[PDB]
Each structure stands twice: as structure tokens, then as C-alpha cells.
Amino acid sequence: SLDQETVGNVVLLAIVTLISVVQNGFFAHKVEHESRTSFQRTGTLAFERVYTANQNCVDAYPTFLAVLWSAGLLCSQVPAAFAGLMYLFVRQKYFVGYLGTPGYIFGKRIILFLFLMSVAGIFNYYLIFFFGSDFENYIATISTTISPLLL
Amino acid sequence: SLDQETVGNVVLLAIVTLISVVQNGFFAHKVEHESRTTGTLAFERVYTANQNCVDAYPTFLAVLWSAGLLCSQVPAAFAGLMYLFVRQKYFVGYLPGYIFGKRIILFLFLMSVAGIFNYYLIFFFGSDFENYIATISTTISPLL
Amino acid sequence: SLDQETVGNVVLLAIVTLISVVQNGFFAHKVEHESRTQSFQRTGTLAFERVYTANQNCVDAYPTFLAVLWSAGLLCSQVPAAFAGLMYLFVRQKYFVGYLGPGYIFGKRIILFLFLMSVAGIFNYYLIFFFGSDFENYIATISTTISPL
Numbered sequence: 001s002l003d004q005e006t007v008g009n010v011v012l013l014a015i016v017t018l019i020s021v022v023q024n025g026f027f028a029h030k031v032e033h034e035s036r037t038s039f040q041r042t043g044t045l046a047f048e049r050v051y052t053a054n055q056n057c058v059d060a061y062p063t064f065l066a067v068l069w070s071a072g073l074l075c076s077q078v079p080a081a082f083a084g085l086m087y088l089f090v091r092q093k094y095f096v097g098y099l100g101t102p103g104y105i106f107g108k109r110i111i112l113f114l115f116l117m118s119v120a121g122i123f124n125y126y127l128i129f130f131f132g133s134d135f136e137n138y139i140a141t142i143s144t145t146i147s148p149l150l151l
Numbered sequence: 152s153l154d155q156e157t158v159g160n161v162v163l164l165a166i167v168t169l170i171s172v173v174q175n176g177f178f179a180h181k182v183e184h185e186s187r188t189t190g191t192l193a194f195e196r197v198y199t200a201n202q203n204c205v206d207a208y209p210t211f212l213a214v215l216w217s218a219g220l221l222c223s224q225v226p227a228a229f230a231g232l233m234y235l236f237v238r239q240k241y242f243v244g245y246l247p248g249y250i251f252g253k254r255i256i257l258f259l260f261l262m263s264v265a266g267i268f269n270y271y272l273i274f275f276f277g278s279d280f281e282n283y284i285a286t287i288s289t290t291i292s293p294l295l
Numbered sequence: 296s297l298d299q300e301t302v303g304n305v306v307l308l309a310i311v312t313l314i315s316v317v318q319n320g321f322f323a324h325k326v327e328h329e330s331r332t333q334s335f336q337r338t339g340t341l342a343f344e345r346v347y348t349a350n351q352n353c354v355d356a357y358p359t360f361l362a363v364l365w366s367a368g369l370l371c372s373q374v375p376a377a378f379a380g381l382m383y384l385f386v387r388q389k390y391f392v393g394y395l396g397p398g399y400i401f402g403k404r405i406i407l408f409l410f411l412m413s414v415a416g417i418f419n420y421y422l423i424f425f426f427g428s429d430f431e432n433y434i435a436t437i438s439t440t441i442s443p444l
């Protein structure tokens with residue numbers, strides 16, 4: 001329903017979000033599959049490994065999505081989207097590592113890079129805003145100075 | 152802060168999201184009610200159910216808004232309202248397996264993909280129209 | 296990507312969101328550190344379990360927080376929403392620390408406040424929409440009767 005110009009600024013970010021959704025579903029399926037071989041949080045050693053891995057991924061996901069969209073909207077879409085893809089590859093390798101484990105946190109540098117893009121984007125906005133208001137006051141001061149000349 | 156036309160494109164999705172928040176709160180309250188009193192069977196049941204609901208919420212929200220913004224608001228919002236009904240019955244039944252509302256999520260995913268495909272069709276058609284006019288403008292240039 | 300006018304309507308909410316990201320990272324670091332005193336599991340030392348549960352309680356709440364923060368910020372008014380969001384990050388920090396040395400829920404009133412803002416904004420949208428619809432009908436009713444000059 002949104003306009004053509006807006007969608008073009010977010011389409012790549014949407015694609016990566018949607019792929020991350022497929023991955024979320026894959027992780028969730030692996031939890032379901034290992035639970036079947038009533039649902040509890042405790043069980044077989046194999047189940048607890050998958051459940052933990054999934055939980056570790058779920059915990060970090062809203063953070064990832066927040067920095068993905070911040071970076072993609074405020075800074076530049078392509079690099080953010082590419083880093084978003086890189087995150088998903090790292091997620092996959094992290095999750096598979098538990099199916100043998102790695103620690104609690106993963107993909108620190110990608111989240112950091114996306115966070116850095118978001119800060120760079122906010123600084124960029126303010127540089128343009130202060131430039132715009134500096135240009136506005138410059139015209140308004142001249143208009144008062146040039147005021148008697150045009151009569 | 153947003154303008155009238157944009158809010159009209161999200162208002163239904165926003166309402167559905169707010170109802171889910173109330174539902175999230177209700178589940179959380181239910182945990183708190185049992186927490187103050189692998190522990191007790193009663194507490195473990197509510198905590199796990201809530202935990203399963205919380206786990207899937209970001210994904211739900213991602214595909215709800217993707218579908219609503221990229222494809223069409225009404226069907227996405229309605230499917231979202233259906234998720235909340237299914238989710239309520241899933242949580243109450245605990246007091247099933249790990250996953251619920253599988254098909255609604257899939258449907259919202261398919262809407263999003265259909266919306267992206269729709270975007271690309273309009274884009275490539277627009278650039279073709281641009282090139283078409285540019286061609287005739289070059290052909291009928293000297294006749295002016 | 297986004298235009299200067301739009302960013303201006305979301306910059307404060309973005310800032311509050313990025314600080315919550317830093318806070319989430321801080322909490323996750325607190326889980327990572329205590330997990331190395333222990334293969335990663337959910338159950339272990341009383342020190343690890345308390346930090347893990349604390350983080351988990353915050354993580355359970357976070358998507359609801361973002362939902363109400365942005366709804367309030369975009370549909371009602373940016374400044375108070377971001378301010379309320381910033382208060383949530385303060386209360387949340389007090390919650391996490393105190394948990395290591397409160398129950399499951401925290402920051403209810405801020406969540407409720409951001410929720411009510413969102414509802415208030417939606418109602419405000421419908422007030423302006425129906426007024427704009429009635430104004431459009433009012434001009435049409437005059438135009439159709441004045442048409443024979």
C-alpha cells in the first residue's frame with residue numbers, strides 16, 4: 001500500500017528481515033523436532049542443546065532487527081542489508097555449533113558495525129539540519145538588509 | 152507526528168499491535184501471579200507457555216508489518232487478529248507443542264513476498280515507460 | 296534513505312532505541328562473563344542462574360517496549376514518548392542490578408503510559424479524519440446547489 005519511492009529505500013532490508021524470519025522458523029522447527037523424539041523446557045541432552053541455542057538466538061534478534069533498520073534507514077541501505085545477510089550466516093554457524101558449544105553472545109562485530117552506521121546516520125541528519133537552518137537564517141537576514149533597495 | 156495519509160496506511164496494523172501488547176501483558180501478569188507464590192507444576196506451565204509466546208512474537212511482528220506495508224493492510228491486519236485468537240487458545244491450553252499459528256505466519260510471509268514481487272513489477276514497468284518515452288522523444292526530435 | 300523531514304520526526308525515538316541496544320548488549324555481556332565461570336546451559340551456579348533470569352525477564356519485555364515506544368512516538372507525540380522510553384531504560388537498569396543482589400514484571404506504568412499515548416493518537420487521527428471527511432461533504436453539498444449559479 002506504501003508508495004513506490006519508500007519501498008525502494010527498504011526493499012533490501014525487508015528481504016533480509018524475511019530471510020531472518022525463515023531462519024527463526026528453521027530454528028524453531030529444530031526445537032520442535034528434538035522435542036518429539038507434552039512440551040517441557042527440560043528433557044534429553046540433545047533437546048536442551050537445541051532449546052538453549054534457539055533461546056540464545058531469540059534473545060538477540062530484536063536487537064539485531066532494531067540496528068538493521070536503524071542503519072538501513074538513517075545511513076545507507078545496501079551496506080546495512082549486506083551486514084544483515086552476514087549476521088544470518090554467522091547465526092546459522094553459531095546455531096549448528098550447538099548441534100554437536102559456542103558461548104552466549106555471537107556476531108558482536110556485525111551488531112557493532114550496524115550500531116556505528118546508525119550513529120553515523122544520526123550525525124549526518126544533524127549536519128544537514130543545522131546546514132538547512134543556517135541557510136534559512138542567512139536568507140532571512142539578507143531579505144531584511146536588501147528590503148529598502150527594491151523600493 | 153506522521154501525516155494523515157501515512158497513518159491511514161498503518162492504523163489497522165497499529166491497532167492489532169496494541170491488542171497484542173495487551174495480550175503480552177496478560178501473559179506476563181499470569182506469570183507474575185504464579186511467581187510470587189523447574190519449580191511448581193503450575194508455575195512451570197505458565198512460564199513455559201509465556202516463554203513460547205514471547206519467543207515467536209518478534210517474528211510475528213516482523214511478518215505482520217512486512218505484509219501490511221508491502222502488500223495490503225486489511226488482510227494482514229485480519230490475519231494478525233487471527234494470530235491473537237489462536238495464541239490465546241494456545242496459552243490457555245497449557246494452563247500442546249512448541250509451535251503455534253504456523254499457517255498465519257506463513258500466510259503473512261507469502262503476502263510480503265507477493266508485495267515485493269508487486270513492487271518490482273511496477274518498478275520495471277515504470278522504467279520501461281520512461282525508456283519508451285525517451286525513445287520517441289529522440290525519434291520525433293527534429294520534427295519539432 | 297529516509298528524507299530529512301521524516302528523520303526529524305523519528306530521531307529521538309531512534310536515539311532512545313540505540314541506547315536500549317547498548318543496554319541489551321550490556322546485559323548480554325553480564326551473562327557471557329558469568330557463563331565462563333561455569334558447553335553453555337541454562338541451569339548451573341546460583342550466580343549464573345540469577346543473571347540469566349534477570350536478562351531473560353528484560354528480553355521478554357523488550358519487544359513490547361519497542362512496540363509501544365514507536366506507536367506512541369509516531370502516532371501521538373515524539374518528545375514525551377522518547378522521554379518515557381528513556382525513563383524505562385533507567386528503571387530497567389535499576390531492575391537488572393537489584394535482581395543480582397523485584398519480581399517478574401517491571402516498568403508497568405511507563406508501558407501503560409506509552410500504550411495510552413498510542414490509543415490517544417489513534418483517536419486523534421480518527422477525529423481529524425472524520426472532520427476532513429465532513430468538511431469535504433460540506434463543500435460538496437454547497438457546490439451542488441450553487442452549480443446553477
Ligand SMILES: O=C(O)[C@@H](c1ccc(OCc2ccc3ccccc3n2)cc1)C1CCCC1
Nearest residue numbers: 022024025026028029206207210250253256257
Ligand atoms: O517448521 C516448519 O514447518 C516451518 C515453520 C516454522 C514456524 C513457523 O511459524 C511459527 C514460528 C515462527 C517463528 C518462531 C520463532 C521462535 C519460536 C517459535 C516460532 N514459531 C512457520 C513455518 C519452518 C521449516 C523450514 C523453515 C520454516
Ligand SMILES: O=C(O)[C@@H](c1ccc(OCc2ccc3ccccc3n2)cc1)C1CCCC1
Nearest residue numbers: 173175176177179180355356359400403406407
Ligand atoms: O498489571 C498488569 O498485570 C498489566 C500489565 C503488565 C505488564 C505491563 O508492562 C510490562 C510488561 C509488558 C509486557 C511483557 C511481556 C512479557 C514479559 C513481561 C512483560 N512486562 C503493563 C501492564 C496487565 C493486566 C492485564 C493486561 C496488562
Ligand SMILES: O=C(O)[C@@H](c1ccc(OCc2ccc3ccccc3n2)cc1)C1CCCC1
Nearest residue numbers: 059060063105107108111317319320321323324
Ligand atoms: O560485550 C561487548 O563487548 C559489547 C557487545 C557487542 C555486541 C553484542 O551483541 C549484540 C547483542 C545485543 C543484545 C543481546 C541480547 C541478548 C543476547 C545477545 C545479544 N547480543 C553484545 C555485546 C558491549 C555490550 C555492552 C558493553 C559492551
Ligand SMILES: [Ca+2]
Nearest residue numbers: 058205206354
Ligand atoms: Ca526469551
